[PDB]
Design a binder for this molecule. Structure first.
Ligand code: ADP
Ligand code: ADP
Ligand code: CFB
Ligand code: CFB
Ligand code: MG
Ligand code: MG
Lengths: 229, 229
């Protein structure tokens, strides 16, 4: 009953920045941010920083991170499907990344990088499938917004943001993630267990340019794209 | 609507053996075996053997094993709550170990053995809680059957069974698990997030003696205990 749109994009491409100009465009919109800070100080519903543990020894912590990161995002997105939004008129729910990015972009890539052995990779997909199998049907996307920026623009915006764990991120890693986004959201040549995705609508925004300027345009293309849903 | 009883006990104490004499005692009984073989050849719903990986390098694979082992047992127990049992008269569902053993016995112990750091331990409990939070209410136990045997009897029965991964298991490990079972099912001095357990009925069977003989007794005490539920 609520339109759910996922915001996809490379590390530091500008998702959180795009998310902050969303609510002010319509009282009917909701945003579920990526629980990034919660991965940095692992506490039960100051402690460990699994995001950094993974970035510092991926073949040791990729599975754990992928396991916790995804469950985490699902809970956040599910919680928001029980808020004031239910009482809204034209409720549109935004997701900062999706269970798909987690699996077909990051997890997929860490595994192709030998950072997860067959065993870890098999267990992860089995979990991931079963997750959707359960609390999945209520999270399907009506549309996707691909925030597109060159991995070179990404590597620089990372530097601007200043998050410590990400400061050691190499261009090469950003490139691999880039092509996977391109393969999934641009060329649309990515295979997944969730058939509906293949048909799901996609809005591609070139955010390589200054947000200061391209802002007015984007708002237009967003309202636009949203009406066609 | 179905009485669900959990069978608890140390490694090789005699659970599977006890499980095999159960169905023949009443057509109304069902048994959900511990997915042990499925942990030995990790395949999606010949591959990896996470059970052995964990026994050979616990500080590397305890979390993974605990994560997969528990989800696995829940699915198995949940599936059986949708079988021919629903059509039964006096349906009694048996569980070979429970999500509690997984957490308050094995996981708890691996963590006290520095085999899981705070981060892993925090993530595991957060997952474990949230799991029950979901598909939990329908798995509550009406009663527990503690199959009690000395860790020394256990170490020998392990040798009899012949499972390879377990052949390297030291008495010391069996002792630690022993006292945790004693603490939970005997002295009943174990603290858990699931309050009902504290009141749940318990049947303690001393299975240190030959199964060939103590069999007739056990059957009596089982039917007995079951009637009082
Ligand atoms: N379109 C843009 N133009 C200029 N700077 C941008 C743009 N988008 C993001 N930034 C900068 O990048 C940083 C934020 O990146 P961020 O939004 O956190 O990436 P993500 O949303 O994927 O985490 C900010 O410090 C901001 O100054
Ligand atoms: N009460 C018993 N008396 C004699 N032998 C037993 C008894 N219980 C189990 N065994 C032996 O131990 C082995 C099975 O242990 P098992 O049932 O697999 O432990 P668990 O059920 O915890 O996995 C068998 O090979 C069987 O011969
Ligand atoms: N699924 C994810 N896997 C990995 Cl290895 N990293 C992820 C995942 N989802 C988000 N992130 C990380 O979250 C941080 C903020 O987006 C970035 O370091 C990176 F994008
Ligand atoms: N939760 C469990 N954790 C660990 Cl480390 N091992 C477990 C767990 N549950 C069952 N097992 C194992 O399953 C095998 C058969 O019961 C034994 O090696 C041992 F009991
Ligand atoms: Mg972000
Ligand atoms: Mg067994």
């Amino acid at each position: 009953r609520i339109k759910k749109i996922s915001i996809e994009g490379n590390i530091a491409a500008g998702k959180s920045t795009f998310v902050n100009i969303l609510k002010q465009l319509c009282e009917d919109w909701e945003v579920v941010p990526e629980p990034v800070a919660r991965w940095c100080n692992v506490q039960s519903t100051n402690g460990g920083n699994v995001l950094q543990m993974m970035y510092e020894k991926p073949e040791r912590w990729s599975f754990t991170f992928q396991t916790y990161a995804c469950l985490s995002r699902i809970r956040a997105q599910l919680a928001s499907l029980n808020g004031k939004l239910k009482d809204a008129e034209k409720p549109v729910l935004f997701f900062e990344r999706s269970v798909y990015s987690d699996r077909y972009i990051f997890a997929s890539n860490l595994y192709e990088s030998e950072c997860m052995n067959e065993t870890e990779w098999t267990i992860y997909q089995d979990w991931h499938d079963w997750m959707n199998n359960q609390f999945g049907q209520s999270l399907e996307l009506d549309g996707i917004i691909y925030l597109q920026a060159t991995p070179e623009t990404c590597l620089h915006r990372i530097y601007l943001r200043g998050r410590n764990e990400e400061q050691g991120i190499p261009l090469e890693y950003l490139e691999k993630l880039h092509y996977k986004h391109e393969s999934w959201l641009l060329h649309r040549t990515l295979k997944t267990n969730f058939d509906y995705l293949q048909e799901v609508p996609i809005l591609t925004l070139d955010v390589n340019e200054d947000f200061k300027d391209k802002y007015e345009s984007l708002v237009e293309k967003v309202k636009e794209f949203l009406s066609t849903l």
